[PDB]
Subunit: 306 residues, 5 copies
C-alpha cells in the first residue's frame, strides 16, 4: 500500500511510423513518493548522478523501475537524479525517448483527431499504488501552428485506472491487480500538405476524362483512352512513394479504384460505338445522349463515400 | 532431469522483412520451475530488479538463459524479475523484442495462411527438461479487423518436441538430446490494399490492349503499340517500389511476362499485315478473323496459373 | 553560488532532417571552473582518461554532467579529460555528437537565414551559476563557399540568459531558477542546386501551356491539354523524392496548385469553344480575344505570393 | 605449439550488400583444445554462462578470442559456453552474427557461382597452431530450392593455410607466422526474378525499334523516334531502383548503351531521308534497302558480348 | 618529450556519403614506444587481451588513447593487444572502423583525384611527441581494377606536422602545441558506370531536339515541343535517385539548365512562326535560315564549361 505520486513532462512528440503504428516521445518522468526518513549529510538533501545510482542500489534503496506497455524495446535512460529528502520523500526524474506503439485508427486520413496514449505501470509491484497522476506539458507547441503537424492540440488529460491479471501470479486474492496510469493526449494533424497537392489532381482528372466522349474519330479517341489509362497508373505511382505506407488503402486512393472502373465502363461505350451492331464505328444518337451523364455521373461519387 | 514450466505472453507481431525472411515480436517469457527451497527474508518472497540480478549470479543461482534459434543476433533483455519463492519455485519473466527468422513460403501472395514459428531452447542444457508449455496470448487483436494486417488470426497452438544432436557433444548416450519448445502461431494477411490496387490495373490493361487490332492505319496502330509497350514497363516500374522485394517473382507479376509476350505475339500479326506477301499494309480477311481471339485468347490465362 | 566558465568548440554542423526538425553538430565543450585546491602528485597537474574518470566519481569529485534541451536522446561521450589543477581549477573537455532539435521556420525555402540554437543547462543544479560563456568556432568553413551548404555564415553570437521553473521543485524561494546558456549560431543555405533545377522548369511550363489556345482543331488541342495534365503530375512526381519531406508545402510547390487551377480554368475556355451555344466547336471571336490574357495572366502571379 | 581443433556451424547466409561487398552469416563457432587438466567439482564437467566467463578471466584462463579478417566492425557475442573438462579439454561455442566482407567478382551477373570466404585467425598468437578444421553445415537449405536465393549450393569445403607477417613483429625468426583457417563456401543465386523480368523487356524493345523504318511520313516517324528515346530512359529509370547498386555497370545494362547507340545511328538514316541531297524527305531506294539490316543488325549483338 | 612511433595498416576504404562528406575506413593502428622497463613473467613478453586491459589501467599503465579529428562519433575498438616487452617497449594495435569526415571538393565529378586525409592526434598530451610515422598499406587493391571504385590508387604518403592551440590551455609557453600525424592517401574513382550511362543520354538529347525546326505544321511541332519538355524533366527525374545527393549541382546537371534554356529559346522561334507579324503560322525565310544554327549552336557549349 505504498503511495506514489507521478508527474509527466512532455517535450516532443514526433516520428509517426504507421507500418509499426509507432511514434516517439520525449520528456521527463518524475516520481515523488515518501519512503523512509533517513539522514541527509550536511543540510541540503542528497543528490545522486547517473552512474552513482548504482552505488545506491547496492544498499537496496527501493527505486522502482517503471515500465511502459506501449513501448517496443527499451527507452534510453539518458540522465537521472535522486532528490533524496531527509523526510523520506524521493524525487526521481528521467529523460525518456522510447518508441511507443498504440492503435491509431484512420477513419479519415487527412483530418484525424488522433490520441497518443502514453501509459505507465509498475513492472513487478502489485498493490504499491500510484496515487496522484499529473500531466505537466509546458512547451509552447501551438504557436507554430502552420509548422507543427500534430501539435495543433487540445488539452492534456490524465487518468488513473486499474487492471487485474489472473493467469499471471499464483496468489489470486487482491495482490494480482496493477494500478495503471493511462495518460492520453490528443493531437490533430496539420492537413495543409495533405490536402493541397493530394486529392486536388485526383478529384478532377475524372473531370478531364469526359472529353473522350466528345470525339468522333477512333484515331483520336483511342489514344486519349490510352492516355487516361497511362495517367491514372502514373498517378498511383506518385502516391505511396511520399507517404508512410499502409496495409489498408487510404481514403484518397479509394478513388483510383473508380479512376479505373469509370474508364473501364467507358470502354463499354467506346466498343458500343465500335461494335454498333448495324454500322461501323460512328456514334449513334444514344451515344450523343450519354454526353451529359458521362461528366456528371462520376463527380457525384465523392459525396457518398466519406 | 530438472523440470521447467514455461509460459509465453505475446504482445505484438510486426515488421515482416522478406529479403531476410524476418519479423519482430514482442511479449514476455515466463519461466516457473522449482529449484531449491531457501529462506525469503521477511514474509513476502524475494524480488530482484534488472541490475540486481548480477548480484545473484555471483552466488551461482541457476538462472538458465534461454536462447532462440529463429533469432538473428540477440534480443534486448529490457526488464527482468525473479519471483523467488521460499519453496524453491522461481518465476522469471522478461520482455523480449528480437528479429526472428523462419521460412515463409509464398504459395499465393495476397491470400496466405502463414505460420510464425517462435521457439525456445536451452542453450547449454541437455536433459534439464522443459515439461509444461503454455501459450498465453491475451491482447485483443482481431477487433481492429480492417486495421491489423496479419492479426486476423486463428488460434494459439503450442507444442513440445524433442531434437537430438550427435556431432555436437562427446557424450553420445542420452545426454545430447535437447528438449525443444516450438510455439507456432498462424496469421492471415489483411488483403485489402494487396488486392484493391494491385492486380486491378493488371488483369484488364490486356483488356485495353485488343483495340489496336480494330485499327486500319499503321500510323495510328503503331503508336498505340508503342503505348502498349510503354505502359507495361511503367506498370512494372510501379510494382516493386512499394512492396517488400523478392528474389522470386510474385504471383502478381507472373503476368507482366504475359503483358510482354501477348503484345510480342501481336507484333507478329501487325507484321503479318505489314509483310502481307501479296499487297501492302492493309489487313487481309484473316486479320479480320482474329478479331475475336485477340481479346478473348489472353483473359483466359488468369484461371489456369493459380 | 559556484561559478562556471564554459567554452564551446564547433567542428561540424550537418545532416538537417526536417520531419524531426533535427540536425547534428560536432565539437568540444570545455568547462573551466574552480572547485577545491588539492595536491597534484609530481609537479604537472593531474590528467585522467576516459574510463579512469569512473575511479574519480567514487571519491565524489563534483563533475556536473551538462545536459542539452535541444537534444533527442543522449549524445555520445566519445572522449574525455580532467585537467585537474592544484589550485582547484578544473578543465573538462568532451567531444559531443548529438541529434539536436530546434524550431526552423521556412519563411522562404531556398533563401533562409536560419538559426541553429545550441544550448546548455545544468541538469540538477539550481544556483550554481554559469558565469562566463565563450563560443570558440575556429574551423575554416567559409573558404569552400560553393561546397558547404549551410556554412556560408555570419558571426558567432553567444548569450547567457535565465529561466525559472515553479512546478518543478518544492522550494520556491530563489533556488528553482536555472542559468541557461543559449549559444545561437546563424547559417545561410547555399542555394545553387535549390534554384538551378528547382523552379526553372516550374515557372515557364505555364509559359509553355498557352500554346493550346493558338490551336483550331479539337483533335490536336485535347491531346495537348492531356499532355499539360500529364506533365504537371510528372513534375509533382519529381519534386518530393529528392527533397527532405514536409508536412507543409514549400514555396516552390505553391504553384503546382496554380499549374492545376490555370489549366482547370483553361478547360472552361475549351468547353466554351465546344459548348459554344450557337455553333459547333470552332473558336468564336471572344476566344480569339483571350489570346493575350492566357499567356500573360498567369506569369504575373509569381510576383505577389512571395 | 598449442593445438586447437575448430568446428564451424553455419545457420544462415543472407543480406548481400555489394556497395560494401558485404554479407551476413549466422552460426556457431566451436573450439575444442586441451589446456591443463584441472579438477571439476562434482562429477560432471564445469559449465559457465555468459557473464560468468568474466569471473574466469580474472584467474587468467587462456581463452583466445578469435578474430575475423573479413569482418567490418565487431560481431555480437550473443551467447557463450565453456565445457571445461577435467582432462584439460576446453569446448567453447559462440553464436556469431557479423558483417563479413570479401571480394565477389561479377563476371556474369544473373548466373554466378560465387564464393563466400569466411575465415578465422588468432589475433595475438603466433605459433599456437590451429590443427584440425571442421566445417559442419547441417541446416537443410537446398529443399526450398525456389525460395532460397543463394543457398542452391554445392559442398562444404574447409582448408587450413599459413600466412606470415614480417613488418608486424620484431622477432622475425619463426614466431611471426599465423595459422589461418580459410573456410570457403560456394553458392549459386536463384536467377528466377533476375531473368524473368530483367532483360526480357531489354532484348526485344530493340525488336520493337525497327518499325520506325517502315514508315513513310516524318510526322509519324519522328514522334515514334522520340518515343524510342523516351522508353529507353524510362527503362534505365526502372533498372537501378530495385537492384543493389554498383560502381560498375551490370551485364544487363551493357545494352542500354546500345539502346542509345543504335537509335543514335538510326537518326543518321532518318536525316539521310531528311537531308537527302536531291529531293525532300521521301525515302530513297537505298532507304528501302536497309529495311532488313535494321531489325537484324542489332539482335546479333547479344551473342558476342557475353 | 616522450617518443612515439606509430604505424598504420589500411584494410578497406568504402562507403562515401557526401551529404555528410564522410567515408569509412578499416585497418589497424600500431603504437610502438618505449616506456619503463619492467619484468615480464616467464621468458616471453606479456600479452593482454581485450577486457584484461582494464586490469592494467588500474595500476596506471600509461596507455594513450589516440583520437581522430576527422571522425564523427567514436570508432569501435573491436580488438586490442599489449605486446609489453621487458625493455619498456610497448606495442599496441587496434582494429578501427570509424566514420571519418574531411573536405572532398568536386571540381570534376566523374574524374576526381580525391584525397582521403586520415589523421591522428594525442587527445590530452602536449609535447609527448609522435616521432616516427609509418603508413603500411599492404592489401592488394589495384588488381581488381574494374571492380574497386576508388582504389585505383597512387602511392601511400605519410607526414608529420605540428599544430598549436592558444585559447585552449592556460600555459601558453611551449606546452600547448600538439604533434599532428596527417596521413593523406589519394584515390581515383573508377568512372565506368559514372560515364557509360550518365551523360550519354544527356549530351545528344539536344541533338534529338533540333528536329522540331524541320517541321512545317504546328500540330506536329507543338506536341514534339511538349515531348521535349516532358523528356527533360523525366531525365532530371532519373538523375538524383541513383546518386548520392548534393547541395551543389553536379557537372552532369549543369546542362539540364541548358536543356531547359535552349528549348525555352526555341519557343521564341516557334512563336516567331506563330506571331509572324504579317501572315499566320507558316515559317518565313528567316526561319528556314536558322535551320543550321539550331543543331550546331548548342552542341558547342559542352567544350567551354568544363
Amino acid at each position: 500500500p505504498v503511495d506514489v505520486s507521478v508527474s509527466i513532462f512532455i517535450n516532443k512528440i514526433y516520428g509517426v511510423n504507421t507500418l509499426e503504428q509507432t511514434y516517439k516521445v520525449d520528456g521527463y518522468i518524475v516520481a515523488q513518493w515518501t519512503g523512509k526518513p533517513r539522514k541527509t549529510p550536511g543540510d541540503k538533501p542528497l543528490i545522486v548522478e547517473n552512474t552513482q545510482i548504482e552505488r545506491w542500489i547496492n544498499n537496496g534503496l527501493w527505486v522502482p523501475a517503471l515500465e511502459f506497455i506501449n513501448v517496443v524495446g527499451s527507452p534510453d535512460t539518458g540522465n537521472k537524479r535522486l532528490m533524496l529528502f531527509p523526510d523520506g520523500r524521493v524525487i526521481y526524474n528521467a529523460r525518456f525517448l522510447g518508441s511507443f506503439s498504440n492503435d491509431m485508427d484512420f477513419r479519415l486520413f487527412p483530418f484525424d483527431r488522433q490520441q497518443f496514449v502514453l501509459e505507465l505501470e509498475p513492472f513487478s509491484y502489485n498493490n504499491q499504488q500510484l496515487r496522484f497522476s499529473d500531466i505537466q506539458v509546458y512547451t509552447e507547441n501551438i504557436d507554430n501552428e502552420e509548422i507543427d503537424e500534430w501539435w495543433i492540440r487540445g488539452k492534456a488529460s490524465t487518468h488513473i485506472s486499474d487492471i487485474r491479471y489472473d493467469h499471471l501470479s499464483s496468489v489470486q486474492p487482491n495482490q494480482n491487480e496493477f494500478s495503471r496510469i493511462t495518460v492520453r493526449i490528443d493531437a490533430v494533424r496539420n492537413p495543409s500538405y495533405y490536402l493541397w497537392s493530394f486529392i486536388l489532381p485526383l478529384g478532377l482528372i475524372i473531370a478531364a476524362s469526359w472529353s473522350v466522349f466528345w470525339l468522333e474519330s477512333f484515331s483520336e479517341r483511342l489514344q486519349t483512352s490510352f492516355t487516361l489509362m497511362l495517367t491514372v497508373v502514373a498517378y498511383a505511382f506518385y502516391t505511396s512513394n511520399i507517404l508512410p505506407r499502409l496495409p489498408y488503402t487510404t481514403v484518397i486512393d479509394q478513388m483510383i479504384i473508380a479512376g479505373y472502373g469509370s474508364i473501364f465502363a467507358a470502354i463499354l461505350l467506346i466498343i458500343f460505338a465500335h461494335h454498333r451492331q448495324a454500322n461501323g464505328v460512328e456514334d449513334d444518337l444514344l451515344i450523343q445522349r450519354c454526353r451529359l451523364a458521362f461528366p456528371l455521373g462520376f463527380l457525384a461519387i465523392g459525396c457518398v463515400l466519406v
